[PDB]
Write a protein of this length. Structure first.
Lengths: 95, 95, 98, 102, 95
């Protein structure tokens, strides 16, 4: 895997470090990006999840804490995304 | 059909796995993408439905459940979309 | 002729629909326009109307029915749009009796 | 030199309208701005994107644009800022719209 | 370093002057671009943060002040970004 990973999450393009994707052991992205996969038309790694919500999943992977926009109406949806990506501490934070 | 399908739903661009579109048998998207279609100017598969609501149709196809944003004012509209795409269990969840 | 999938620019908002949807209701304005027309700089068919309201006009053309968002504050404005597009049954659905 | 479909940037909000709509009311500001009666007249402010720029409230222009299209005013249900729009109609020099908003 | 620096901030491409990146001494971008790193697949300088919030970070580097859009819902998120980029005076302005 390259140092900088190019992702396509349900249509939205994200760039992150490989270390960020494998930062939390036993999580879904850690299982997927183990240093040892579906690709988009432009050769980007594809994740079949909501693109807009992934922005906050990424920031939780970067900081182990995520600040949400004022009057964020998708807390419950982000909790479901956190459940899918298997991030129990983020699930606890969003309950 | 490619592994990652590029969709244009009434103006809104979505990317999903082909398996996700054919996940529910006897549904409309299953009929449309059965391996045995209208295309946009940029060669994307076209769906003549509301683009904004398709976001929640996609998440239901991904998880066989969908979490909606807080104070979602388009439950009735999504129910009509679920009826069109022939997803009875999603229609039941929105009633 | 007209393509299968029509690219529209309605007062700034970009919409994509099937040509069959635009000519689904005979003697309506969109039927008159697309029966076999201004174009923007990007070559999209231009409609000089409110872009946000067109979303509900499109759904009425798709199903001959339209569900509106809860506490929709532009019922009167959509009625005016329905009048412009010459959709009498949609006008009747949006007109209050009291 | 004006295109059939004019791309406008009104204080941040992007609007698309026909050139005929902008010059529909003679002696109004948008008519002065866009009229080919200008003959040797070219300047109008443009944004970075190349769109014609109008230094006014973007949200209220929506109802100014609909008055030019229909020569009537259909407003959203429970619209509070009626005076602000009349002030916009005063700026765009639309006396008949001013009279409708009284 | 070139006069005009090409950046990739979590997917979003930004172009700025080298002087703007080193305008505030002892900040993270100063230490990164000092005349005395990570690169994207296309050879662009990579920053593993949120791409959308980074425009405001550049505005503060240019003018030493930042005007936010009316009803800006991401003040808290931009405060976290300001903390990461080590801009204490910007953090104080966002508290």
């Amino acid at each position: 895997f390259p140092e900088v990973v190019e992702l396509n999450v349900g249509g939205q393009v994200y760039f992150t470090r490989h270390s960020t994707l494998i930062s939390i052991p036993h999580s879904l992205l850690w299982k997927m990006f183990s240093p040892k996969l579906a690709k988009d038309s432009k050769g980007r790694f594809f994740i079949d999840r909501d693109g807009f919500l992934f922005r906050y999943i990424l920031d939780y992977l970067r900081d182990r804490q995520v600040v949400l926009p004022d009057h964020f109406p998708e807390k419950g949806r982000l909790k479901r995304e956190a459940e899918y990506f298997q991030l129990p501490d983020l699930v606890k934070l969003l309950t």
